[PDB]
Amino acid sequence: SVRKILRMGDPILRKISEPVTEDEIQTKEFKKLIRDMFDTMRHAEGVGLAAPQIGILKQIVVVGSEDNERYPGTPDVPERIILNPVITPLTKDTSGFWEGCLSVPGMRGYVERPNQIRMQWMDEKGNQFDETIDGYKAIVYQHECDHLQGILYVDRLKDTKLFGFNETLDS
């Protein structure tokens, strides 16, 4: 089902989310969470979603797009469950994007993040990954790990001048 998405202002979105145990992923309620999470992220037309965004401080991130209406330009993104992630910048080069967040509705903000990172996670399966992601993917992944350390894009806005509502930014 679709869970209620917490909005910027709730202190939860700022608390640090702790790791998931190899025990949990094989748990029943966990599987029911990934279900909800996906169901919620889709109804929201978002590129991804972090557990805390719905009240759960577990290091659980979800993603997936395929022709998105909320961010027209962007490339389709393949669904994937990202757990206990750990990103690291592989360069100082940065790609700029007017990011948005389901937890900060109706607004957009230019944010410059590194464009090439090394990330290491784990899946519903228990598999260990450790690749180097680049381009839009990296952006989204970074954006969503942030939620896990209580960080929202507004905290990184290149500059408050470049931040506002949609209805007005496109005009």
Added chain:
Amino acid sequence: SVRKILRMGDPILRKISEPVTEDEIQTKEFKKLIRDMFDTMRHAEGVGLAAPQIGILKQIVVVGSEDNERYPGTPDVPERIILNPVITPLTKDTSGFWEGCLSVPGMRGYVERPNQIRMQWMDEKGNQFDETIDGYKAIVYQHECDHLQGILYVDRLKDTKLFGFNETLDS
């Protein structure tokens, strides 16, 4: 009548508004602006309003409250037309407030501003003033002169952690 209030994202709210001429205040359309401005500020239940907030880059600020629903606590404020203002900090001491703005609907942000300033303006009459304002008044006056130099409270947010929507901040 009530004019449409520009929302954060419109580049106008960031442009510098120029001064008003002793000629204008005695003008007909000017008087019609102060009318609208007031009518608009009231319908909005705001403590004040700056010309640019409705598309006019003239150094015209308006104020007035008396039992406000949008900011319950705050002291009533007496209507007044403030023109070509010029504020100056008279201290480093600062009072904190979760400010809001009609141009940035549904949100609130903790902002620390000086609590004792020297301001010099002019009225619909043409009178020259130069007093030292303190307390809530100073806050509001500073908040509204900012609009004249293209500045919104988000640009001063003490810290992004303390910024969010109303429905969620009170909870």
